[PDB]
């Protein structure tokens, strides 16, 4: 026979190897596939889909339909934001439970950009202006309206549209501190006539084109 020489690695099974293997059923009638719609190539595609962030995880509001209903309540102009959110997509309970976030449990590194979308869940007759803010990493949560307003902010008029979208720029993982996303009463809620003074809002985060991942890990029990 041809002179051959056995090197280290022979007879050892690599869990994530790439070798050719002998087939148990030669010539089997493999049913060919059909164009069932729902063909995916990657996981990130699933992450560039909007997902209702369950902001409210209070004692009762955690694990019931209210976890998604961030009420615009009758209080004063107390500048401590209507909503607060820490940009730790996997290291933050509200973001770790998202479609995007679940995928972020399957890697150690994620990098790129994300986007927040808000649905105003109030009357056509109701109006007002709110403010969406993002202070990139380093900066702390901006405690007063002004502080957030000073930086990247979006003034969103209710009485003009129900759809608000503010994209988040550059970030990176190792699953320890990132950015923050916040909502503020720019103005306040204008109620027309005798209309329920406490309506809600719905937030949807989704990844950006530039968002991808690296180093595959897990967790199961």
């Amino acid at each position, epitope marked *: 026979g041809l002179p051959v020489m056995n090197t280290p690695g022979s007879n050892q099974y690599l869990t994530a190897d790439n070798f050719q293997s002998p087939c148990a059923l030669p010539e089997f009638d493999v049913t060919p596939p059909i164009d069932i719609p729902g063909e995916v190539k990657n996981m990130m595609e699933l992450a560039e889909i909007d997902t209702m962030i369950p*902001f409210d995880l209070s*004692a009762t*509001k955690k694990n019931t339909m209210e976890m998604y209903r*961030v009420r615009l309540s009758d209080k004063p102009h107390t500048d401590d934001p*209507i*909503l*607060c959110l820490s940009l730790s997509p996997a290291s933050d309970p509200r973001l770790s439970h998202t479609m995007l976030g679940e995928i972020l449990n399957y890697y150690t590194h994620w990098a790129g950009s994300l986007k927040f979308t808000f649905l105003f869940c109030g009357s056509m007759m109701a109006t007002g202006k709110l403010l969406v803010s993002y202070a990139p990493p380093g900066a702390d949560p901006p405690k007063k309206r002004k502080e957030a307003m000073l930086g990247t902010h979006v003034i969103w008029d209710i009485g003009l549209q129900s759809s608000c979208t503010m994209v988040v720029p550059w970030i990176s993982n190792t699953t320890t501190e990132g950015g923050y996303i916040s909502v503020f009463y720019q103005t306040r809620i204008v109620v027309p006539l005798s209309t329920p003074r406490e309506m809600d809002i719905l937030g949807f985060v989704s990844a950006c084109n530039d968002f991808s991942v690296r180093l595959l890990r897990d967790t199961t029990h």
Partner: nanobody, 122 residues
Framework: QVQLQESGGGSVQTGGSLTLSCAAS????????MGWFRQAPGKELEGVAG????????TYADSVKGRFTISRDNAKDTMYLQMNSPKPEDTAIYRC???????????????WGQGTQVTVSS
């Protein structure tokens, strides 16, 4: 992870001074700000008190300012909710975990503790 464990609650003669605690079973106890939410039977868990990230700010609800007190222990994790002079409405279920804010539970520090029922009986 910081997992919060609530202590300090129960019955008191209306007009006492109940100090309520909440141990942080995690490193970043120095995390964010802090707070105490109360919820009446079937009613919402409104933001009562709050302290800062360091343990410096003092933020209270309209009812509770002047009497209620909050103080997070840096060294020994737990924040102290001292309900100076508790009243009939202070007969609510108390919760903790409010780092990054006050006012509403519609935000703050999501990972919330269980619960302790305070019954102001005079």
């Amino acid at each position: 992870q910081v997992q919060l464990q609530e202590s300090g609650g129960g019955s008191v003669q209306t007009g006492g001074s109940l100090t309520l605690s909440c141990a942080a079973s995690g490193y970043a106890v120095s995390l964010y700000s802090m707070g105490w939410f109360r919820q009446a039977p079937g009613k919402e868990l409104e933001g009562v008190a709050g302290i800062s990230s360091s343990g410096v700010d003092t933020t209270y609800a309209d009812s509770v300012k002047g009497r209620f007190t909050i103080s997070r222990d840096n060294a020994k994790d737990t924040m102290y909710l001292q309900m100076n002079s508790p009243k009939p409405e202070d007969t609510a279920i108390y919760r903790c975990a409010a780092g990054f804010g006050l006012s509403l539970s519609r935000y703050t520090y999501a990972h919330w503790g269980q619960g302790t029922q305070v019954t102001v009986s005079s």
